[PDB]
Amino acid sequence: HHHHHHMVHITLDRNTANSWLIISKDRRQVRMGDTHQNVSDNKERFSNYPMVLGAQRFSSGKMYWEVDVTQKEAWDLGVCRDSVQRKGQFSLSPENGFWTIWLWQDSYEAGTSPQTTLHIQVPPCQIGIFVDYEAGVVSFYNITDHGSLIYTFSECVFAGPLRPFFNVGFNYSGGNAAPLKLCPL
Template identity: 45%
Template sequence: MLLTWKDPCVYCDEKCSVLGLEGITSGRWYWEVKIENELHSKWTLGVCRKDVRRKGNYLESPQRGFWVMGKVNKSYFALTNPQTWLSSMQDLFRVGVFLDYSEGDVSFYNMIDGSHIFSFPPASFSGALFPYLMIMYGAVSMTVCSMESGSEGLPVPLNNFPPLEETLSTPMEGFSSGCGVDGAPPEAESLLLP
């Protein structure tokens, strides 16, 4: 799945977000998000419950069903209560997201150097969780990459997403639309819920 905001000059109270199509209710999951963004941008990624509010100006926190980390301009953060500012680090271009549903673990990794970024305190999940991407402003592109095998020393996926990338289709100005995946298996379904 791919989410792209094209206009780096647009700032607004609206957020654009997408969810994975199928919910996660058990097991250990791992995927990576490729990120391309300019300096002045704001985005988050992680997991959320399906029933969360995602219209208008909403807040992301574990208390509201979001376990996410992100970037605003030059700074990285985890949306805890209160917000946790992450130590100064290199720009993130590929983030690994690890979810262990039964252990209540949501963790993030910098896949350029394999370092740990942040782990939320263990949570007690109820209901399905979905991969989540959000862009608020800036020229940003985020792509969820399916993982066939894990890297040595890092979380290993026990379940995999189908090998599919898709572009968000939306009538809102400033977003790309269309899709196309060469060689995707016929049984693969879209990973997006608008």
């Protein structure tokens, strides 16, 4: 692809984080801690899942960023409305304000309702995310496989400002401790 010139510097918003997440000093990395991280609760924090939002809000234009997923077994990535539900159980779908893909149990799927099987020959170590607000597009790219297309959500109805969205996943197996990292431009 040729989206690299729309690169944006994303940082993580600590206030939105699940209380077990550990975000690095530079706000560019996040991982699952083995306990509560000693923060107060608030109405913004994701309660049920190890999720966090980027600080940046997008309401126009074209945006691109990259995320490192090396040696993770489970994660969700994409964008979401600023006003997505934070508390309780919910599914990642456009109806609920999410445009996401994920890895789970050795398969990759797009967060449609119901979910869509992805066809990935080269397991990605870094994912590129492109948003065209005006066109209503969210696209995902396999940076490990020379930028090959993973998935495009088109005819998106964003219906609000967008925020970068992350889920580091649970670590019940002991094999999913590794962080998500925002990759440098």
